[model samples]
Target: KFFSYILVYRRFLFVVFTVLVLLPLPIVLHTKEAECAYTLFVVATFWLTEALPLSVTALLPSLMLPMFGIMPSKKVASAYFKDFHLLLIGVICLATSIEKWNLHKRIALKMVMMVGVNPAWLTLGFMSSTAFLSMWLSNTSTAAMVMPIAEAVVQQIINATKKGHVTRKLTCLCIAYSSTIGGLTTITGTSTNLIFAEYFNTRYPDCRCLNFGSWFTFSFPAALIILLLSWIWLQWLFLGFNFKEMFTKTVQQKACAEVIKQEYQKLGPIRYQEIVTLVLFIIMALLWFSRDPGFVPGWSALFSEYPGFATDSTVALLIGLLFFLIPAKTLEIVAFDYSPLITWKEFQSFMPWDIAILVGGGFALADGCEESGLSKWIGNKLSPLGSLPAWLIILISSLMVTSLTEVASNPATITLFLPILSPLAEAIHVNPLYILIPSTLCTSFAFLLPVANPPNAIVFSYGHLKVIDMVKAGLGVNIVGVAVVMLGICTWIVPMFDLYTYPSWAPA
Candidate 1:
């Protein structure tokens, strides 16, 4: 068995090496400047199509640009370490600490337990908790943390129901839909939010970026409305409740007790590590909200006391501090001494380099388009659309791009679209934020496919979801999401946030 495993692994390594070594031969042979564009095209295509990690894929542009003389080595190399990437890395570090200490699970379970076992209340609980968590943590992480409890709850419901007594599908659908809907509630709740935030910041530097508090306030109502409606929609579409079989006093008691016991066992007397992680996150949140505060006429100005201190830097430093101070402890084994909790090495191993690279690559690609005047070129190409009314543009663009992102990378899709829209917004003499904000927000509306977002991928891997099943369940939510983003932005968000005042020729 060992020998067979070694042989398989060796074969895999051989294939990888052969592909990597041979794939660039075409570009190397081509010596003309015109061929550089084709070479870049080949390299990008290979990177996207190959099954390699996304970070590895991102590295291709850096290597290819320098090798093909499309850009100098120094310039291409600097792309990997952009400010956007650094910000993402800092957030990941903080998220890593939360996950490592199981603080997310503790919080999730606490919320679930608080909601109790009533189906509607349970759905609301999961939705609100998931959305709330997503506002700060990554949506993928939020789903991963919440999904197991949801699954456990569903399993309990199934076990309690005798053969042919109840439909397990509705319960499963509710959990999945709630988790997905919650992701749309805030910018921090989803990476797409960051993509949009970054795009806005890059495009309109003078405009305020959506702070955590502002994002939560703006999106929470829309998110809540959609979330509640989704639950009702699912029940209406797949409703067949077997009250006696699905839930009983005994079943609820057993499930609730088990959940409590499991949480207790997992948490096991809150350690200093957990406490430190929570405190650091609190400080990070405070700094993030106050990072860019406007002056109040009379009172002390918000975050005015601290200038040049970025929220990302604050989070990165606090997390780094925990590595040295907090001692690690083993689970259910109080005697075990696992000191120096949350080491840099352990944190680095789980850093989600793929996400960071993807983010950086998207930013770099956007920069390239801007630098090369490709954004303006594309905007000129789409100038005909500029003649349409702003509302029509928002509606058409929001729906089309929201649907397109269901299958493509959200950041990549945005990167590609922003260049065109940034210019289009210029051509129309309208606030570019009107076009860009909805475009960015709609990227998070991918619900029809498991591959749409990491949260979807994580949930789908449980082996229960069919593509068609997701389509059937998620189609309405997808439409609702589009509506929410469009209406939310147009009616209240744009005006309230002063996004409408953005200049037309913003350099996104």
Candidate 2:
């Protein structure tokens, strides 16, 4: 009888514990006033756990905002279709096409062949290809495409150098290191670029968005210089392998033998998928760059004179409709289905709902901060720090914030920082983009930690890296990356692009 009573007591305790843990959820869900705070908490918990895919996390705002009364259902639904989100979707589709067709590998190998077999040249070849490809494709995809080939080259070098096998390890390190460095050189090289660009559009509508041609034209030279510098630095700092000794005719012969065996032919004359991908990307680029000019001198003027067909919405919709018409296969009677490239279901799976809720909740919170006079209050609080030398402020703030972001969601960090900094920039009369753009880019420089970015995580899973090894190699590159971006912005990037112009009140 006593034993039976103990069992009942244990069951009662278990039920009580479960109810207590779950009790806050429904309370928070039902309470409108506490919704933002609760949603923020849930989002934070989700990220800490990494318990679900990111896309699912993106859907939280859509569901939670209505429940919490932070936003109407219509507004929450519309957020999913924001211009930036649509642009990202289109870009993803284009990237999928390239991946499906194996064009990325073809591009990487062609580049390697162009540089021949010199170790330094080979490193530069891979780095250059990565940087160039990253300007259009995602950095993760660029790295994924190049890493295998790089590993293969390293294996071949190892087999040949029976006595100096350890040196081959450094060669592999150089390949991995250079791919990341190349990403830092361009805006489209990583998702951070799009985030920064989107923020720029939101905060300062007057300045032009950095379009494809303009971004590449500016970033390519910087990427090349950095790649060359890294090659020199790594050679001196790590292996001291004589480039002349490394690039021998014998080595070339061995590399060629391996390459011949691994050759995978491009299948079936470029399909409709390839053609549509190219054409759509080209059109997107054209529209993006030409939006203002076309609106002013072309579309708007023509629409004004004729009055029936050239509205911006009409033009945008027409171009979007082409995606449906462009057949995925010429052999098929029907137009190619975009459904396979990325299904609505697949997209749903990847939506990052926690991020979406956090973003919306944060935006509302920031608005609350502003409405309650917290921005000015905070700006005043931070004004003493702002009084420091501009370079010092940039260095300290960017490094600290970026380091923190290496473990958190970079977009979330930026979304939080920008609201705070915009007021600070205004308080000090500094160009906001000058500060914000660098901060955004630096977030992607968190190469030392797998938790920093998806690409870092993908590479980490390849079974060769430890945290210490990644940090040991990634640290030097990280410092160099910071310097490179600062130099690029201050010297070539800002002046050449007319980004250096300051308001009259801004300090010189």
Candidate 3:
């Protein structure tokens, strides 16, 4: 009951931040830019501290922007919904359908079983499977789904090995990082990716659409590179010192399959629901990848040219609808009763509606900053960086965003920073995505703190790790992750986005 008072304390806290940002009481930027800046500061502080529900903190601009004469109430409210909002809604419904059938868990385990068990390869197995699932499923959902099975295998290893305790700590950490890193490979894999894609696509309109295939061209390799290197780093840190006492590859791996085998069997024979879910999932991936394959028209072109009827959302919602229409044949036979791949009740319970609002909130903030000239103001200050080389720009953005993300919301961080970064790139005479894509990727690289990401937090709660344990492992990996983002952007992503050549679509 005493904690109830803590909940109400931040309302007055909001007033203090507001007064501090206003000229009459304190000192800072100009009125127009000041309003936008202050909204971000207050929301950022509240979001970092979690004084309110993250979604509630996100809602502040809708109310504060209008009250400060920053934007109209109608316009501010409109920021909470966008077409990308629907795409996420439909995609998540499909994820919900997958969960209802328990297919996500099955997929992760089957993949892990193919790899043999050794501290190095076994952790690699966890990372590999978690990363693969994450590119398609929500990272948080993927982390939660994989952690139990990881625990099963880990429990087996710990009991049988001399260094069992250290193995458990490192194994859980590996899976957590894998889930977050996994989301990096695909746009739909993480809402953060969707945030980047929607923002960039909306601005350029036509210049170099970031179709599914294009994003994977950059991110999939980035994720694989990070996962591989970090797997090596973690193994060295946690297992290297314990070398003499560590389990031998054969001793550990033989037990590995048994645990996995037992858990895999628990799911029983695969059912029609899983079969249906898997088919729908493959159908969505095939449609997205083939949609704009270079040198040939995509299925969307069939709907119309140069921006057509069959968008990514069109494919997502189309399959999602079938999940509701197509009966779960297995369920029908067993219960002779109510069945849909996913039910309406499932939506109320499983859907991440807050994320949709949070995303829309980020867009609204971008809109407010751009309209109010805050972006340009921020850009002018950053223009000094123009003297630096292009690679340096990527490194700087990678460092700043990854560091802040240790304690900030990835989506919120991206929303606030992107409006500024886009203009910043133009001020420096570079492609917006040259900077934008890296910053977006860096947001998901917050490996240092549990609060930095959901996957990290979920794994930390497994009670095997101390905050110190995460920090020790995260410090080097965070640097490696940022390094990969910079390196990948400069080298691998170059030909795809043509970073050095300059994009004509960048606004003058």
Candidate 4:
């Protein structure tokens, strides 16, 4: 009965209790560091409890720091709008331009058709396309965009042949799973990526290896590797039945090709906006990849005398302006009346400013810990864990965060934990990324519950599934997912970034 109202009770109840417990404890100690820990626990409580909106809870540290005399009001205020924060703001709005130009859907259909229509390939196509789209657009929006199309594609499969309801359930899980999983491909691939980048850079300002291309080099292959394995598991678990068994048509036929073709046709020839959007995306990627160009002087290096002036975000927004500046024109319509690309209103609603607040708050929390000397305090307490082997630590952090995020938000989960985890990593003399990167990537690995992720929630709303269906399937992915992160970090991430030994930048 106490937890009946999900948001109010489940969220606010624990939120108050954490405050209730921490409020007096910090004052009794009467130290800045203890108070800092007090503030952190409070914010984490609100964040974890969903007591306040996640972003709202983010707004807490800034307010508390000033009130509690932990950090200066001026410094805390500046934390919210750091240059990288603006970069995220710019690119997040630009993501809306993809939907604005119908580019996302078209890409989905094109990829699907190109992959062909066999049910097996169709499953792979939906998962592949959804994953790729999720990398660029918001995971929830990507799932929303692709779910209808997935439903239509599956409906086509039923019309063309016969697969059981189990197939449709599998198909729904495919889009939702891929949507969350795909986000690790790049920095802008998901909110958590940006969160990790912002916090990581802030924690160790000199560690520059997380630049776009390096992260892709270090993270993408592992992401793709796990995605492929998850795809296999999803298909086998829910859809082991083959097209050959259901459809008597020639083996070479495209079972779902016509559906994709129809979608492609409906989109018609690409328009001026689509072309502009595509160009912007491509150039944005190139500029980011080339920022720390290996074997070549990066664009940043060219500005040796004036460094960090032009950034990936600066470049991203610079091109983003073209969508607004250049009027959409064509042979049929040579006027501004066709609308540019995305409107200012679209930018307002689509951009998750709250997340921006969370990012800043994360940085603020770190400052409070470090400046307050709480990091060292916490590090001493956690010194025992330092003796455990690296892989076991990785396993513990990955599974704990992954499972909690099934009920809590992934980005919030990571943010709440990073401050604590960083110190633990430092005490153990383990490179934080050795523990941190795997932990951040595992945020997207939630599969057990519909509420685990936005895409999960969106797909669950289709009314096709019950909780048990999600749980049974989620168990396999979650278990395998923990292993994937462990292996990937041990092999791919460590090798790609040369992270076998702790970098000098990691805290001593």
Candidate 5:
């Protein structure tokens, strides 16, 4: 009875223990680095235990840094609103505009119908579409938008043909899976990606190869490879591998096609907002892709006098601000009520503002580590791992993070680990990305539990599944992610990022 009571009060108990013990452990050591470490310790426990909200835990650095004399109050506050925060806001606004216009839904339905309609083909269609959209939109938004559609289509098939038990489960599972897989395609694809990018840029300011287009070029292929393999595995696992049984369809296939067709028609035609949104999105992408293609001078090179003057964030903000300026009802000349494409209310409602705090806290944590010399101290301790072979080190980091992410949020995991990894990279003379890139990507490879990811949680709430169903299916994808991620690291990542040699920016 006592043990059970302790378990019930775990959050309160941990908070008290953290303040009484963990916070003062460093004072006994009487070192600034120890103080920083203890602060991280306190924050990590609070984050892990969820005694405080994740965003609330993030504010710990703002308070602790000043108290511990680690960083100036102004400096700590500034860390929360860096260029990456701007980039995040801009990208989120763009994504919000897309959702507001229902552009993503139209795209989902259009892609589904364009692909085949048999049960097997329908699964593939939903997976591909969800993956594609997830690359640009938030994983939660993509999953939430597509889950109802998947349910509707599956219900249609079952109602018309009375045979869709496997299809229903498979469709839901694939959307959750692919939404995760698709996020690896771009830098702004997920919160973890943004965190990784922010840390990378801050640590190595001289490195210019980590922009939107470069990341897309390197990661899109890797993401696609994983997505395709997952598609095959999810189908085989759910629909079975019998070729004769998989392909044969009659009434159910037609019903599936009609369901998607009617949904497509229900969206009517693309509206003014969609056309403008698409045009602006394309223009932003082109600017980002062409900004510094490496082989040739990008348009940014025109500003030779001011290096790093205009980066991806610039284009992102440009397009984001455009959305607010452009009127949604431009053709309404009679009424003359000109309203912007996205109101501030919609932006506020759709935007994950709390994430901004979380990300800022990550930056503050890294900065504190640097200021307090905690990273160097930790690096000295972890240098032994560098003695291992490069591939093995990569594998270890990937597996470690993949497992951790199954129980922790990806951004929190990244925040807690990245500052430590950069120092370890310096200590070992390994190019940071060799380890950091794979580890960051692995955070999204969480497929085992419903709580592993928002996409997973969203799909689980549909009530068609038991936890065991997700576990059994997600296990295979997790293993496949490890293999494909390892292969990608060995082949493309090493060459693309020039990971073999230690860079001048990272010195021990």
Candidate 6:
């Protein structure tokens, strides 16, 4: 009976078991460090097993830290939301508004329509558009938008090929994998990237090593390289490397184009809301890039005296807030339904509160780890890694993160790892970002498991593909990703961020 009960409640059992075994040992040891370590173990176990809701487990530090005297409840609570969190909110609002107008869908279909209609060309088209959309919008939303269109077009193209099943399955996986790749190209591309940015700024406060333009410059090439290679891999692996057949425009290819063209036509001309959203989105992106474009003084230079006052968050909210004010129908007369570009109701419903809370929880955990001396102690213990070369160590770190990312969400995986990594970099006497940035980027490359990313799960839910199919296709992409990421970090990222020398901000 006892064993059966344990099996039934295994999820709750681990939380209880950890508290019973680990909590008292810390209390008996009478050290704050041990207490903090105990909290991390419990929290990490919960994150891995998901015994509690991931976001609710995130609430633990706010409660446990004050009880254990590690950090004040007030400070812990405050860590949950920061300027970056607001930037997250602002960017999400912008994406939600864009989705409201179906601007993303129009952009997606238009790209596919323009790209040629053969299996390889269509695959490239889907991957390219999905990757581009994901840079600014949430990956899950981008995948959702592209998956249906790909299905519709793939279905038509399949009529031309004896291997229709391969075409449909590969096309869906392409969108899933490419969306993950897209998130790597920009800071606001995904929550994990923002988490990394927040941690970098909080730890070094004095340095401006990370920003929209800087991250884009470093990551875009690597992402693009991986994307093209994955496209080739998918084409050869599934479509059987028949280049002559793939490039040829046949009657079926024309039919495929008609299906895509019809979907684009169904949208029935773009709306005013889309144009407004695009204009604002463009202005917002340019402002983010030019706000602090590392090459020369950016427009933020105007506030030269007030260092740290202007930020990407400032620009994000500036334009994002306009949506609530700008009327969608500018020339409309006296209709009560006349609404802004985005309404409060739409914002509330589309907003990802759970993810926002998860991000906040991560911030709190990082702070608790630092204050409790957990990070420093762990860092000091990892000093032996100094014997290894930086590239070898980075390769190992990237591999470890990519594996963990397969089982957990990207934000959770990153949040759990970064506090320890920052200290690890310090202890090893290397530039912190040399380690942190690569691992952060690796979190998005978990192409194997459906649960690894929300976008993967979104595509999986469509039931057009199987887990075995994802696993088979994803393995090669994962290998390619690790190699390209290593190359990017060593060749460009080093010079781009002056990563070879340890900075004053991190301390010796």
CA RMSD (A), model 5: 3.9
Report the lDDT tens digits of candidate 4 across residue range 81-190.
55565666667766888887789988998898888666777788889999888877888889999999878877766765235588898889878888877888877778
The segments of candidate 5 whose C-alpha lies over 4 angstroms from its true place after superposition are 1-14, 17-35, 65-89, 161-163, 244-249, 290-311, 330-336, 367-380, 383-385
lDDT by residue (1-508, candidate 6, tens digit) is 9989988988777767876887675868888888888878888878876678888988988888777787743432334455566777788788888888889988888888888766688789989999999998878888888887788776666655447777788888899999989988987788788778877776676676666667877787899999999999998888777767653457776777777788888888977889999998888777677666655677653365776566777777878999998888643356555577777888887665766567567777767777656667876756564788877878788888999999887877888888767767777789998899889988888898877888988899988788887999899999999889888877877876989998888887
Tell me how far the alpha carbon of residue 415 in candidate 3 is from the true structure, in angstroms, after superposition: 1.5
Candidate 3 lDDT over 188-234, as tens digits, reads 78767876776776666656567666677567778888988999889
User: Rank by lDDT, descending?
Assistant: 6, 5, 4, 3, 1, 2
User: What's the CA error at residue 206 for candidate 4, in Å?
Assistant: 1.6
Worst ten-residue run, lDDT, model 6?
72-81
| True-structure RMSD, every candidate | 6.3, 7.7, 4.5, 4.4, 3.9, 3.9
Clashes of 2: 14
Q: Which digits, one per residue and each the tens of the lDDT, describe model 2 over residues 279-358?
A: 76676556544434412343423334556344333444456545545545432546533444334444444233344454
Q: Which regions in candidate 1 have their CA more than 4 angstroms from the true location?
A: 1-51, 65-69, 72-90, 161-168, 185-187, 202-208, 240-269, 279-340, 352-356, 363-380, 504-508
Worst 10 residues of 3 by lDDT: 72-81
lDDT of each: 0.62, 0.58, 0.75, 0.76, 0.80, 0.80
Worst 10 residues of 1 by lDDT: 292-301
Clashes of 4: 0
